[PDB]
Amino acid sequence: SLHDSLSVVKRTLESGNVVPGGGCVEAALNIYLDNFATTVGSREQLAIAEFAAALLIIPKTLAVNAAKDSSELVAKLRSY
Amino acid sequence: KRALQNKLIVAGGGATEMEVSKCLRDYSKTIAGKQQMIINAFAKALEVIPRQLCENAGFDAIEILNKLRLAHSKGEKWYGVVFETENIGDNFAKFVWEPA
Numbered sequence: 001s002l003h004d005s006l007s008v009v010k011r012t013l014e015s016g017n018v019v020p021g022g023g024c025v026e027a028a029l030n031i032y033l034d035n036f037a038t039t040v041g042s043r044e045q046l047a048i049a050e051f052a053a054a055l056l057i058i059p060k061t062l063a064v065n066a067a068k069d070s071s072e073l074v075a076k077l078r079s080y
Numbered sequence: 081k082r083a084l085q086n087k088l089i090v091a092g093g094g095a096t097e098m099e100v101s102k103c104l105r106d107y108s109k110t111i112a113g114k115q116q117m118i119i120n121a122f123a124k125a126l127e128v129i130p131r132q133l134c135e136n137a138g139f140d141a142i143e144i145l146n147k148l149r150l151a152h153s154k155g156e157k158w159y160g161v162v163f164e165t166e167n168i169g170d171n172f173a174k175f176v177w178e179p180a
Contacts, residue, residue: 038153041146071114079112 023059027077030056086179093160093171094130096178098152101126130161139166 012018019025033052037045059077063070090096104123108116130148134141144161147168151159160171171177 038150041150043142045146046142071117072112075112075114075116078116079110 023062023074023077026055026058027074031078082179088180089177090180091158091160091170091172092176092178093162094133094148095158095160095171097126097129098148098159099157102149102152133161137161137163137166144168 030052033048033055037048037052040048056074059074060070063073066073101123104119104126108119108123111119127145131141131145134144139161144166148159148161151168156170158170158172159168160176162169162171162174
């Protein structure tokens with residue numbers, strides 16, 4: 001077990017730059033990119049908005065696989 | 081007729097729908113759960129009016145809707161679809177109004 005635990009912690013530490021998972025990146029980009037879209041006002045505003053929305057498939061899928069109601073788990077992320 | 085019967089008016093040409101849609105998009109920012117998605121869907125559905133007003137008139141609905149959203153965020157709550165020359169403008173000053 002110690003050999004396993006050291007491998008798990010090492011893998012995390014090996015990456016000099018880390019970003020929180022669990023939907024943090026996708027949910028954060030969803031909101032940030034949605035604001036970005038508002039600076040265009042042409043055609044890319046729609047492509048950016050749909051691109052941003054697409055990233056929510058990850059926290060949505062994770063919630064469904066957890067047997068939890070994605071409509072609350074994902075919505076709460078958008079709020080936070 | 082309505083100019084004499086209804087003293088309480090709001091700007092037309094989608095201007096009223098734009099202000100409601102905006103206030104809904106902001107309201108939903110404080111709502112969590114299933115209600116958030118439905119409120120936003122309502123805010124989106126309201127845009128069917130300025131959308132179809134543009135499309136049926138032969139206008140570039142995508143450009144006009146984008147200009148309406150962005151121009152409205154500046155605080156001018158009477159922006160709407162102009163049918164004289166394809167653009168957006170103050171439909172209250174231009175006397176394009178509907179009873180409240």
